[PDB]
Amino acid sequence: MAAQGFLLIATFLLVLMVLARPLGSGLARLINDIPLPGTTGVERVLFRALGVSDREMNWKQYLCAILGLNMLGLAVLFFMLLGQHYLPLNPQQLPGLSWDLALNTAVSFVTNTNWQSYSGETTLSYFSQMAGLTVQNFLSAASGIAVIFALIRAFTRQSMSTLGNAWVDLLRITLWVLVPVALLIALFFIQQGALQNFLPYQAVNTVEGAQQLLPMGPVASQEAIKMLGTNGGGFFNANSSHPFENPTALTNFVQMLAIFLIPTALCFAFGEVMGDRRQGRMLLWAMSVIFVICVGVVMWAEVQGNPHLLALGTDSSINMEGKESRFGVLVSSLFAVVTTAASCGAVIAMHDSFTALGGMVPMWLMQIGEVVFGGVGSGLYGMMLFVLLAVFIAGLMIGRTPEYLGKKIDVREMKLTALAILVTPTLVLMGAALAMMTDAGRSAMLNPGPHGFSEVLYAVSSAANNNGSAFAGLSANSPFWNCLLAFCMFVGRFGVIIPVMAIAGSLVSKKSQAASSGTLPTHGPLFVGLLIGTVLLVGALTFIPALALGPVAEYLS
Amino acid sequence: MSGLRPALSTFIFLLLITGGVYPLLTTVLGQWWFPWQANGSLIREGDTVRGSALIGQNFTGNGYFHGRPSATAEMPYNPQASGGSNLAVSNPELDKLIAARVAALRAANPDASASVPVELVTASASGLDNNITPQAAAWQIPRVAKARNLSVEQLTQLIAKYSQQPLVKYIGQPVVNIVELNLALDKLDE
Amino acid sequence: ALFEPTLVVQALKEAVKKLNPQAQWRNPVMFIVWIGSLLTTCISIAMASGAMPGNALFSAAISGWLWITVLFANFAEALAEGRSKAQANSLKGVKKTAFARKLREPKYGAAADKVPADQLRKGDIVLVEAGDIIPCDGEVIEGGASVDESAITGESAPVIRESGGDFASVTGGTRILSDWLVIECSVNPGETFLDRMIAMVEGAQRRKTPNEIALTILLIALTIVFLLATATLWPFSAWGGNAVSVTVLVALLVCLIPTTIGGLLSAIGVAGMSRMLGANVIATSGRAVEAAGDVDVLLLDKTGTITLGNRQASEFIPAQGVDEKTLADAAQLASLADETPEGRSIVILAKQRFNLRERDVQSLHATFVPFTAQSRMSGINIDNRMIRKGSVDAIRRHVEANGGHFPTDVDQKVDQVARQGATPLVVVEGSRVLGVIALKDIVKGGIKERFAQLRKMGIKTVMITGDNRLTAAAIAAEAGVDDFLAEATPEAKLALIRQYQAEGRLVAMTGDGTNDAPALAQADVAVAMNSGTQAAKEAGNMVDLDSNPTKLIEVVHIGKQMLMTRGSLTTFSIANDVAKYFAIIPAAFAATYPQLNALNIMCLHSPDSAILSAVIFNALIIVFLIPLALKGVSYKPLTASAMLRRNLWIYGLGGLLVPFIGIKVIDLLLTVCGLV
Amino acid sequence: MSAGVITGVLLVFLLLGYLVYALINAE
Ligand SMILES: CCCCCCCCCCCCCCCCCC(=O)OC[C@H](COP(=O)([O-])OCC(O)COP(=O)([O-])OC[C@@H](COC(=O)CCCCCCCCCCCCCCCCC)OC(=O)CCCCCCCCCCCCCCCCC)OC(=O)CCCCCCCCCCCCCCCCC
Ligand SMILES: CCCCCCCCCCCCCCCCCC(=O)OC[C@H](COP(=O)([O-])OCC(O)COP(=O)([O-])OC[C@@H](COC(=O)CCCCCCCCCCCCCCCCC)OC(=O)CCCCCCCCCCCCCCCCC)OC(=O)CCCCCCCCCCCCCCCCC
Ligand SMILES: Nc1ncnc2c1ncn2[C@@H]1O[C@H](COP(=O)(O)OP(=O)(O)O)[C@@H](O)[C@H]1O
Ligand SMILES: [K+]
Ligand SMILES: [K+]
Ligand SMILES: [K+]
Ligand SMILES: [K+]
Ligand SMILES: [K+]
Ligand SMILES: [K+]
Ligand SMILES: [K+]
Ligand SMILES: [K+]
Numbered sequence A: 001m002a003a004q005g006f007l008l009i010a011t012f013l014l015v016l017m018v019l020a021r022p023l024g025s026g027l028a029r030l031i032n033d034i035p036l037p038g039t040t041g042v043e044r045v046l047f048r049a050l051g052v053s054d055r056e057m058n059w060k061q062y063l064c065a066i067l068g069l070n071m072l073g074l075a076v077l078f079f080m081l082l083g084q085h086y087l088p089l090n091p092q093q094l095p096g097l098s099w100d101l102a103l104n105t106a107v108s109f110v111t112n113t114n115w116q117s118y119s120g121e122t123t124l125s126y127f128s129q130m131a132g133l134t135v136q137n138f139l140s141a142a143s144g145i146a147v148i149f150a151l152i153r154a155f156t157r158q159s160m161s162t163l164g165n166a167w168v169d170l171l172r173i174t175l176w177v178l179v180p181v182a183l184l185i186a187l188f189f190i191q192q193g194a195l196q197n198f199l200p201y202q203a204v205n206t207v208e209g210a211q212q213l214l215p216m217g218p219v220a221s222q223e224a225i226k227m228l229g230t231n232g233g234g235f236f237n238a239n240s241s242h243p244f245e246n247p248t249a250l251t252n253f254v255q256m257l258a259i260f261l262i263p264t265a266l267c268f269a270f271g272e273v274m275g276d277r278r279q280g281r282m283l284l285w286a287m288s289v290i291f292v293i294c295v296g297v298v299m300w301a302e303v304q305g306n307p308h309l310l311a312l313g314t315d316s317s318i319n320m321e322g323k324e325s326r327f328g329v330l331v332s333s334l335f336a337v338v339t340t341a342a343s344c345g346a347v348i349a350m351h352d353s354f355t356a357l358g359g360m361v362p363m364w365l366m367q368i369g370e371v372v373f374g375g376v377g378s379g380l381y382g383m384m385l386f387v388l389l390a391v392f393i394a395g396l397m398i399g400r401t402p403e404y405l406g407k408k409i410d411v412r413e414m415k416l417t418a419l420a421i422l423v424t425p426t427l428v429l430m431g432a433a434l435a436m437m438t439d440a441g442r443s444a445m446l447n448p449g450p451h452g453f454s455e456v457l458y459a460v461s462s463a464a465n466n467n468g469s470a471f472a473g474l475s476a477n478s479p480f481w482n483c484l485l486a487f488c489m490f491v492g493r494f495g496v497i498i499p500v501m502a503i504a505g506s507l508v509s510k511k512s513q514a515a516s517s518g519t520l521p522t523h524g525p526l527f528v529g530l531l532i533g534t535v536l537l538v539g540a541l542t543f544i545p546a547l548a549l550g551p552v553a554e555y556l557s
Numbered sequence B: 001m002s003g004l005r006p007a008l009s010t011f012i013f014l015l016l017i018t019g020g021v022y023p024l025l026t027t028v029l030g031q032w033w034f035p036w037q038a039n040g041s042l043i044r045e046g047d048t049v050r051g052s053a054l055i056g057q058n059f060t061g062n063g064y065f066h067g068r069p070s071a072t073a074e075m076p077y078n079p080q081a082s083g084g085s086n087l088a089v090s091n092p093e094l095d096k097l098i099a100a101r102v103a104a105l106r107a108a109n110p111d112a113s114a115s116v117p118v119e120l121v122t123a124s125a126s127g128l129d130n131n132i133t134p135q136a137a138a139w140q141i142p143r144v145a146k147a148r149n150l151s152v153e154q155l156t157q158l159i160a161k162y163s164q165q166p167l168v169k170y171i172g173q174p175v176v177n178i179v180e181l182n183l184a185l186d187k188l189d190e
Numbered sequence C: 001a002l003f004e005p006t007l008v009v010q011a012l013k014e015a016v017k018k019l020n021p022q023a024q025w026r027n028p029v030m031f032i033v034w035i036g037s038l039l040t041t042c043i044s045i046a047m048a049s050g051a052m053p054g055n056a057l058f059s060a061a062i063s064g065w066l067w068i069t070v071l072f073a074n075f076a077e078a079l080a081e082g083r084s085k086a087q088a089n090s091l092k093g094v095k096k097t098a099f100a101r102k103l104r105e106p107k108y109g110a111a112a113d114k115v116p117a118d119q120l121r122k123g124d125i126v127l128v129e130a131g132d133i134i135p136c137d138g139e140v141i142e143g144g145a146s147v148d149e150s151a152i153t154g155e156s157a158p159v160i161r162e163s164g165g166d167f168a169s170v171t172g173g174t175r176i177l178s179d180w181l182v183i184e185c186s187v188n189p190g191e192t193f194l195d196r197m198i199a200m201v202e203g204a205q206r207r208k209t210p211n212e213i214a215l216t217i218l219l220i221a222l223t224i225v226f227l228l229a230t231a232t233l234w235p236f237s238a239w240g241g242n243a244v245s246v247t248v249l250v251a252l253l254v255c256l257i258p259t260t261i262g263g264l265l266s267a268i269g270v271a272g273m274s275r276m277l278g279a280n281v282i283a284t285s286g287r288a289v290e291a292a293g294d295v296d297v298l299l300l301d302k303t304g305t306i307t308l309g310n311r312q313a314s315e316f317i318p319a320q321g322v323d324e325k326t327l328a329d330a331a332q333l334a335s336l337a338d339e340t341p342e343g344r345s346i347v348i349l350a351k352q353r354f355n356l357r358e359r360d361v362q363s364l365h366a367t368f369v370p371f372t373a374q375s376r377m378s379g380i381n382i383d384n385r386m387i388r389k390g391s392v393d394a395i396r397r398h399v400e401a402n403g404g405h406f407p408t409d410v411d412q413k414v415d416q417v418a419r420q421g422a423t424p425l426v427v428v429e430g431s432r433v434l435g436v437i438a439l440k441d442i443v444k445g446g447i448k449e450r451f452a453q454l455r456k457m458g459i460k461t462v463m464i465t466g467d468n469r470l471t472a473a474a475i476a477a478e479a480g481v482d483d484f485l486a487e488a489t490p491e492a493k494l495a496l497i498r499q500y501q502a503e504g505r506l507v508a509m510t511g512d513g514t515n516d517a518p519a520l521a522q523a524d525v526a527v528a529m530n531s532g533t534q535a536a537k538e539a540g541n542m543v544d545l546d547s548n549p550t551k552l553i554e555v556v557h558i559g560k561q562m563l564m565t566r567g568s569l570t571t572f573s574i575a576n577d578v579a580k581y582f583a584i585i586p587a588a589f590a591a592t593y594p595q596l597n598a599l600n601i602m603c604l605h606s607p608d609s610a611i612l613s614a615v616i617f618n619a620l621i622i623v624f625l626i627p628l629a630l631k632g633v634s635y636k637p638l639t640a641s642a643m644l645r646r647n648l649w650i651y652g653l654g655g656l657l658v659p660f661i662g663i664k665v666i667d668l669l670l671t672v673c674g675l676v
Numbered sequence D: 001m002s003a004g005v006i007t008g009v010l011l012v013f014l015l016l017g018y019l020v021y022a023l024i025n026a027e
């Protein structure tokens, strides 16, 4: 079992590192404002038709561009979900959503969270799924990658004020990274057995005489983009547990590869754009060490599993409850760690039915800020916030000015880094406290006691951290839960995006001073261990009391 | 004021592409290339759809192969309400359900081991698990053989015929398609 | 000034009892601790009479130890401020009084006037005699003797001051030995760099450096996340079982927030300034001192800074058509009027060794040509011979302007003069060249080791000279510097400032001349000399009282020590919190969650004892780390990665380990004392 | 839920406002 787990981790990381390097070079070309080969001409005439000029905005107009696109998508998706009974492609004649559910789903799919407090096959029509949900799966991912493009450009640019063209960045990302790769992934999913059609719900005569209604719809097209853009918004309520979304083990391997593909490629692109690939390798070493430790812990916990199974007459204590039979507990543990570290809401298995440690480590991995490949762009700039914290600490301990990649770290960047670090744990703690003092927030619990508190804490952490993965035993379809979680997603996305863009606008004006003999190498095992220690220690000192009142209490029960 | 037009133009173009070209091209290419597995992987005999090859149906008969328990709403193995039980380890309801399932499976399978496979007493993640392990199938061979008047050799051969394996042993598990297994059993009987 | 004097400790403890009400809210971490202490005091009063909990003794002990934590943090801050004030008051106790000799005319012996100290302004002329205290700082316009600066510098050996030379300005409060010095006042008393430093120390309104501000922002953010966790712990346990008491939450919050560095930040800053004062360096503010730890290049003037100056004629090579009794006469005629110490030495030794004292010094038709740094010219047109002298390039320029040419013997002679390090200087009649007079310069002494230490620090030291290229090379090889820059105009030094700042490299420099004012103005580190002029001292952000060129070693030492003390104490405070969790969380959750008692890896006695031990350790770590913050961390010159690794291994691992031992020992002491 | 809970929530919000003020206006 341990050998199989080691082989699975090694194969997954090897294939991911092989695949993400050419995509890293392509993303570096996109950062450096160099058009991809073959895209010249058609990109120019498309920009001329769309009316985007050769202008190059600063951080204020770049952030206003991203926020305006996100608010326009939010309004369009909210009205689409509210008035979905007038739009076509509704064979089940599903009614329009309530105001709270529509607002929660709209904010959820715009903030790259993709929390779902509903069953897709019962709630949403085909046109809604393929026309608001899929376009927001593309657009939120493109917005996150555009923000990290701005941050990387700020780190590589010398004493300028501009930050690139935001519309050009969004169009380039969506058209040349998101759409064709998702097209290939969706075609492979269809080949393996995933669903892609527009037929009405097929009636099935069961062999024993029952009658089950099979849901249909363009499942694979949304599945490819929810894998690629670290989105995780399931077509059905089962999410990636559903055989129409993830039919095979090869499909699930491609799913995990697509989840980690763009954050790793963004780390490679960052290292190549700055010229020193050792920086990107340092970042990847930190995330890979934390990820491997977390994966090993979660597979060990799930293999230990339910201790009552041998007492109640079972072959093994293997925690197969709430896990699909086509995937092992090792594969389910790996997917759980990948999605809860990578800010993806996809679940191969119901995390509520996981053991105490195997639910803590995913929930703590969300709670540390989603820095272990934590989403498209979002993980990279959260890791950048932790890198500025680490280089501030390192510069203090060496007696020099705080320094990263030739650029000084000053009072304004420390203020904005501190605020961006502060936004998400504040939301998690206050939202969980508000849910825990309210009967509307406590009546949604399913399991009693420390695991119910784990349910509430997991929901608030996934909402504020733009993850969207759920225990799903919580009944978050109430108006109180919908509004609270929508507020958490909105603030935890945009109040972290805004100070990151402010950091970028503070860092464009500075000049990258060359290295010297006394400078600190921001790479190597010393800085990898320092950054890992900073991330784990900050997340721990924030969230150990919550874990102690939740999953640690359940484990020690 | 000269900044609203690029926002609207980019949003309408990206919405049009990623909501009417990428899904349209995906659907067209899927229906052209992989039509059976794009339309549902439906097992159709004549004009009647007996079930998808991926969803799995609620089998409670003595002569059929029983799959994993389902925790969907309304009837078990309901595809309209897919989702697991979401029951914690510390929840006494999970222990009660496991005890009831173990007792029911021991009553249904008297000529077998007293250590029931874990997937037969643990509910799946989706509630639509069409798959069990060949170990669970081998545990269920005596009951099916007694009910259908077959032999262990033919049952093992048919299970291995309808067994699926991944490319490498660690990315998944060896599984058997329960629905196609039961249709094969019915076609063998008549 | 000792380590902890009895009178200083006993007075500043009363100061700590006096800085309770409104000195706390300027520090956010300590204001949080103060608010928690007041809240726990009110909770304990309610528990004693008016609230349903009956454990008033436990809440009273928690409140008392929180007040003790505030008292020890203010003890650190007040002890640092008291040490700085004691050093400033000891330096203030000079004999500068109302005894002065005002002169209406700047000649010697004018009216023997007596004026008080307040009746002095920017423009005044004062006279001093043997054993006289200097009233006010200023350049010396007449006379020259030895000035004992022991009361200001801290070390004896009177310095030699010359009228309007390299050693022109005089430090106030310093005794005068041997002859008299007629002194013109430069800046009015009360407005002196020493007075500004004394006023900055006494009544400490010290401005925070940007590094301290950023660290304060980081500590505030940690305080916010710890306050959020502590505040949200009440409903989280309230739903699970019996709600955790408010006093335990406040105790955990105080134990969690960066109490150590948050209470020792001002102590670190003031102790760094006091250690700067103890190295005989006056600093305007801590910004320059902290920036000095980031500099990578040091600029150096030759004469005055790296050498004592006072060049004297040693070899005196004549020419073919000069022979004897002509070169000395030409040198005296060219140097009788310029007010430079090398010129005065040439005047007083040329007649001495050639018996040419019969030449008159005043002839009623002297041109009185001064000396300009860029022109490098000196001489009096007294008999239509228009005699001049200067550097080699200036002599070549003046010969090529009026005279015919020069032969190779002049180049050979100036090369032979520059062979042993003495700077060349040759006189010309105007149409013909003459012999070369040498000017021997003495190196300051044991500076090769300090330049090797600067090279080990990674600071590329480089000296800007002017003078002649080969003798600059000789003196650079003798001193042990990395590079040199000869033939430099005064604009070239500012050009080098802007060239090094254009690379982004942070530039330090030292100087003592009055022509270096834009250089010290544009420089990031502008360490002046005590022998320098008042204009240079005012333009510089720092001034050295030891008259030492390589005082940047000690300045870099102190700045790096301040920054590493701040970072190390922050790392220690952050790393203590895992042991704070392991002491408090199983203790805090004992009735609502008795299953959490497995987390008590320290095997502590009771939950109340564990919480009390955590609070006691949080209170006592500040008073245990007062000496570390006062002395600074041990700075050793290594590479950046090795220094970071050593500081991490000795501070982060220390904060990982030491609080476990401390809390365990406090718990065992409480158990064997029977208090809890 | 009660007067004590209201007072505690108000005190925590006041301390949070003071700390955010100190972070934004850290002179
Ligand atoms: C246990 C505690 C914690 C554990 C900690 C471990 C953490 C995880 C480690 C991973 C960290 C990632 C590092 C950053 C990324 C590095 C990328 C890179 O550039 O690499 C070069 C980098 C620097 O070297 P360099 O010479 O400077 O090269 C730089 C040049 O730019 C490049 O020069 P070049 O171009 O000449 O090089 C050739 C080229 C390669 O050629 C190419 O261009 C690629 C294209 C090839 C053709 C494609 C066909 C063949 C490829 C097959 C895959 C694709 C198809 C598959 C088919 C299926 C369809 C999907 O380069 C690449 O593209 C390299 C990328 C691929 C290699 C990276 C492998 C990293 C993952 C390691 C495996 C996992 C180990 C840990 C997991 C298990 C732990 C439980 O070196 C590394 O490879 C670093 C990684 C070292 C290995 C890690 C081993 C860790 C310890 C093992 C575990 C043992 C302890 C467990 C105990 C057991 C108890 C349970
Ligand atoms: C709480 C504090 C605790 C104590 C702190 C004291 C720190 C020192 C610890 C020393 C003891 C460790 C000794 C074991 C030896 C292994 C490491 C080694 O060789 O170097 C030792 C190394 C010093 O290395 P260095 O100074 O860079 O130069 C020596 C290198 O050998 C020369 O390497 P280089 O600079 O030339 O570059 C490396 C080169 C390659 O050159 C070589 O290394 C030589 C050739 C060897 C071939 C192998 C290279 C290929 C890679 C294959 C597999 C590598 C091993 C992977 C295993 C990882 C499993 C965990 O190529 C690369 O660039 C490759 C990428 C570099 C990454 C490779 C390994 C990274 C993973 C290891 C660190 C992650 C775990 C740490 C967890 C700690 C967290 C608390 O020390 C550490 O590794 C430090 C780790 C622990 C740090 C803890 C700090 C925690 C943070 C403090 C708390 C938070 C602060 C508060 C902030 C909160 C804000 C309010
Ligand atoms: N009293 C003097 N008479 C003639 N030339 C002088 C005198 N003092 C210095 N010089 C010339 O000026 C050059 C140095 O100029 P500068 O550096 O401005 O003065 P200093 O060396 O006193 O700081 C030397 O090369 C020297 O030849
Ligand atoms: K997501
Ligand atoms: K989801
Ligand atoms: K965090
Ligand atoms: K974050
Ligand atoms: K965070
Ligand atoms: K985040
Ligand atoms: K995300
Ligand atoms: K982030």
Ligand SMILES: [K+]
Binding pocket: A343, A370, A374, A375, A378, A379, A465, A466, A467
């Ligand atoms: K995220």
Ligand SMILES: [K+]
Binding pocket: A421, A422, A425, A538, A539, A542, C225
């Ligand atoms: K945090």
Ligand SMILES: [K+]
Binding pocket: A421, A422, A538, C221, C222, C225
């Ligand atoms: K923080």
Ligand SMILES: [K+]
Binding pocket: C254, C255, C256, C257, C258, C259, C260, C573, C576, C618
């Ligand atoms: K502390």
